[PDB]
Amino acid sequence: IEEGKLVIWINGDKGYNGLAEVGKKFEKDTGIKVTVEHPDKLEEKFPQVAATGDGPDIIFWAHDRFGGYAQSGLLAEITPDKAFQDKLYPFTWDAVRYNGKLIAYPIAVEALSLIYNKDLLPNPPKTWEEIPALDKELKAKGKSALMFNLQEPYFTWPLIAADGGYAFKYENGKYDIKDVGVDNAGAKAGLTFLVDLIKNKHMNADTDYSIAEAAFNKGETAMTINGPWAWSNIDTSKVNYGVTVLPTFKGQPSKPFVGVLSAGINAASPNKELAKEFLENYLLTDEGLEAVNKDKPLGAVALKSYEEELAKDPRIAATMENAQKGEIMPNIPQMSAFWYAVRTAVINAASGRQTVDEALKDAQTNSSSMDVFMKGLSKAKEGVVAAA
Ligand SMILES: OC[C@H]1O[C@H](O[C@H]2[C@H](O)[C@@H](O)[C@@H](O)O[C@@H]2CO)[C@H](O)[C@@H](O)[C@@H]1O
């Protein structure tokens, strides 16, 4: 029963309940119902469902996915006037431009930070290199040094990029998809450090988002790596935590990929004007962002008037410090292939099924191949064998 309502998709780690509250206010004033959903793998489902009755009117995701959506014709060009554009930071609009056109509304700037338990660890490590020794000390006390999601390359990228890894070479506003940097010396060093941590029993190759979060919020591990959305669950656990700069590697800052959470409008929605009214007049206001932020923190928001309030938060300062040491994600269509390729490399290397060099060599080859994700799905289905 989605006909005649605004349907919104947003990731399940974000403040979907707070977003729903904004939706209730919109409905109160306009009579238009707003249904917020948080399907799994929504970023992969969108292209499969956008044209159907199950497609959302509005989709929230980091800006990196939107170029591929726009290439496929799945997103409407948005039409904010100059007065509205002036309300958000200019660099956030840049993140949602594709072939010269605005294709989403920027919401917040997300970057990973080091999150640490101040009771277990008053002075967090400045370097990745000191982490093995630190884990040894904590293991003796029945604790561990560090746990974070090893199944999503988003979380390992800061380390892979620290000493020189890169996705696609950038020059003069353009990315060269033939110049991939996931298999250079810097990338190799980072992933090798990670794999060594696993070989030496300082981390488990199977650690995922849930496992790491439970471990940190139960006080079992001294550190985790995560974004602003995770601060809320840590609050509930009453763990005394700090949010700080990521450790350095080979004396170089970890360099997270920075995402701008953005709201795109489905090109097939018959309610694009209403979606625009909701996004500009309800969500992107102090009251709207406050409701979402109160649910799960957004990070550094794109709306100047509300960032003015949040800027005093030292956790946001750390977020922006890590963000500025990192790099903005490209939004080119090839990003989906790059992410899948790197995800495969990290997982195969961590589990020991491939060496670092083999894994990253394959990642480089596959990073521009658009068929990689679909080919991945086929492998999971195994397939049959003929009698002849
Ligand atoms: O791991 C690859 C993945 O990274 C980014 O996804 C982030 C997302 O930006 C965050 O908002 C949060 O939800 O965590 C995700 C990682 O689990 C890219 O945006 C995404 O396209 C990419 O697949």
* Tokens linked to 329: 């994600």
| CATH at residue 315 | 3.40.190.10
Instruction: Determine the Cα angle at 317 with ends 314 and 322, to 5°.
Output: 130
Q: Is the CB of 152 under 6 A from ligand 1?
A: yes
Question: Could you tell me if 52 and 83 lie in one domain?
Answer: yes
Q: Is the CB of 13 under 6 A from ligand 1?
A: yes
Question: Could you tell me if 158 and 239 lie in one domain?
Answer: yes
Centre of ligand 1 to C-alpha 154, Å, is 6
Q: Which residues neighbour 315 within 8 Å (Cβ) at sequence distance 6 or greater? A: 113, 228, 231, 243, 297
Q: What are phi and psi of 9, to 5 degrees?
A: -110, 135
Q: Is the CB of 110 under 6 A from ligand 1?
A: yes
Question: Could you tell me if 119 and 230 lie in one domain?
Answer: yes
Q: What share of the chain is helix, strand, coil (3-state, %, to 5)?
A: 45, 20, 35
Question: Could you tell me if 199 and 229 lie in one domain?
Answer: yes
Question: Could you tell me if 141 and 182 lie in one domain?
Answer: yes
CB 302 within 8 Å of CB 109? yes
Nominal resolution (angstroms): 1.9
The whole-angstrom separation of Cα 217 and Cα 280 is 36
Domain boundaries, position 355: 111-256+331-388
Question: Could you tell me if 196 and 338 lie in one domain?
Answer: yes
Three-state secondary-structure class, residue 60: strand
The whole-angstrom separation of Cα 56 and Cα 51 is 9
Q: Is the CB of 207 under 6 A from ligand 1?
A: no
Question: Is 371 part of any known ligand binding site?
Answer: yes
Centre of ligand 1 to C-alpha 386, Å, is 40
Centre of ligand 1 to C-alpha 220, Å, is 25
Nearest protein Cα to ligand 1, atom 14: 154
Question: Could you tell me if 143 and 247 lie in one domain?
Answer: yes
